[PDB]
Design a protein around this ligand. Structure first.
Ligand SMILES: CCCCCCCC/C=C\CCCCCCCC(=O)O[C@@H](COC(=O)CCCCCCCCCCCCCCC)COP(=O)([O-])OCC[N+](C)(C)C
Lengths: 16, 51, 51
């Protein structure tokens, strides 16, 4: 579940 | 420009680049700064970061 | 009025009217200050400027 967010904090050009 | 020694004028300019590049990492990594825009509009989860 | 010389009180005022007119011309020229004023309605064309 933390690994779901470890990819989610790396969009870099956000809006997601 | 003299009342700070000319190393201090470089260490406060490395501290601007030091803090603004650690404020950038923490504001992304913390899941509480990821606020939701569109405060009146409901979901589909288009949360974003202003840092 | 004394601690600054009566000429250098005018170099402040010419800079205060100088920079405030350079900031206005750049803010209209720059294509990144022209933002969308409706967050809740993103896909419209009412792109405005607050300078
Ligand atoms: C967009 C521009 C327009 C709008 C601007 C805002 C509006 C107006 C803004 C300010 C209004 C006030 C006028 C400013 C000057 C007044 C002060 C003065 O006396 O002259 C000063 C500068 O004079 C010089 O010697 C010229 C040196 C270069 C100045 C131009 C910068 C070019 C940048 C080049 C590099 C760029 C690099 C960029 C990348 C890093 C000093 O003169 P002095 O010799 O000390 O005087 C002798 C007196 N004494 C013997 C008693 C000591």
């Amino acid at each position: 579940s933390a690994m779901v967010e470890e990819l989610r904090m790396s969009l870099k050009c956000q809006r997601r | 420009l003299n009342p700070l020694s000319p190393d201090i004028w470089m260490y406060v300019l490395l501290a601007c680049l030091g803090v603004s590049c650690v404020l950038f990492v923490i504001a992304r990594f913390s899941p509480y700064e990821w606020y939701n825009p569109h405060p009146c509009n409901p979901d589909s989860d288009v949360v974003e970061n202003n840092f």
